[PDB]
Amino acid sequence: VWVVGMGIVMSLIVLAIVFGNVLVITAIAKFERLQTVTNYFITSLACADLVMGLAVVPFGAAHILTKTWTFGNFWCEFWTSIDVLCVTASIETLCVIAVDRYFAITSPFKYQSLLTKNKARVIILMVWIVSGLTSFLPIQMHWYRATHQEAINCYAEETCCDFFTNQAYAIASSIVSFYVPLVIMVFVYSRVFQEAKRQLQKIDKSEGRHKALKTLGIIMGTFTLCWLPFFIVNIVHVIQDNLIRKEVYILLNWIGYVNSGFNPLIYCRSPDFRIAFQELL
Ligand SMILES: CN[C@@H]1CCc2c(ccc(O)c2O)[C@H]1O
C-alpha cells in the first residue's frame, strides 16, 4: 500500500528535471541577446543535467519499484558508466563556472585576454574528455571489479545488479570528482568574498551620510549539503565493509541526484533570463 505513492514523487522529479533543463536550453539557444562566452558553461551544465534526468533516473526506477533488473546484462555496466559520467561532468562544469567568476572579479583588465570565444570550446571539450576518461574506460573492460566472494554471483547472475568495487576505483573517483573541485571553489569564493567586503568597506569612506552574503551562501550550501555525505560514505564503506548498509547508501545516492534539478533555480535569475522566459510563454 506504498509502492504507488512513491512513483508519483519519482515522476514529479523526472518531469521537473526535464522541464527545467529543456526550458533553460531553449531560452539560451533561441534568443540572441543571451548567448555569451560565459553562458556556454550553463549550456553544458544543462545538457549534462538533462542527460542525467533522461537516462539515469527512469532506468534506476526499476530497482526501486519492480526490485528486479529485468534488462539485459550488458546494459547495467553502460547505465553505471553513463551515471558516473553525468555526475562528474556536472561537478566539473560547476567548478569551471566558479573559476570563471574568480577570474572575472580578480582581474578586470586582463579578463578579455584570458578568455575568448574559441577558448570556451577547447576548455569544455577538455573537461568533458577528462570526465569521460574515468567513466567509460575503467568500467567497460572490468578494471573496477572486486575479488571478494560477494558480488561474484552478482556479476554471474542475470537478475542482479548493484555497485560493488575494489579498493582503488572508489577512492580514485572520489578524489578526482569531489575533493579537488571543493578545494578550488572554496579558495576562489573566499577570495571573491574578501574582495567584495573590501569594496563595500571602501564605499562608506566616500559616503559619509552585510546583505550580499546570501548569494554566496545559497551557491555553496545547497551543493555542499547535496553532495558531501555521499562521497564521505563512499570513501568509508570501502575501507571497512560492515559499517554501512545498502539502504543508507541508496538513499544518499538518490538524494544526491536531486541537486542537478536545482541548478536552473539558482544559476539563471538575471533580468535578461526572466525577460526571455516571459517572452517564451
Ligand atoms: C551507483 N551510483 C554511482 C556509484 C559511484 C559513483 C557515483 C558518482 C560519481 C562517482 O565518482 C562514483 O564513484 C554514483 O553515481
Ligand 1, pocket-test mutation among 78, 83, 235, 260, most atoms within 8 A of CB: 83
| Whether 257 contacts 50, CB under 8 Å | no
State the distance from the centre of ligand 1 to the C-alpha of 103, rounded, in angstroms.
Answer: 30
Experimental approach taken: cryo-EM
Cell numbers that stand for 244 in this block: 554501512
Q: Is ligand 1 within 6 A of the CB of residue 39?
A: no
Cell numbers that stand for 43 in this block: 549550456
Question: Which residue, by CA, sits nearest to atom 6 of ligand 1?
Answer: 84
State the distance from the centre of ligand 1 to the C-alpha of 82, rounded, in angstroms.
Answer: 10
Ligand 1, pocket-test mutation among 134, 227, 253, most atoms within 8 A of CB: 253
* Domains in the chain with CATH codes: 3-280 (1.20.1070.10)
| Whether 236 contacts 259, CB under 8 Å | no
Ligand 1, pocket-test mutation among 79, 85, 87, most atoms within 8 A of CB: 87
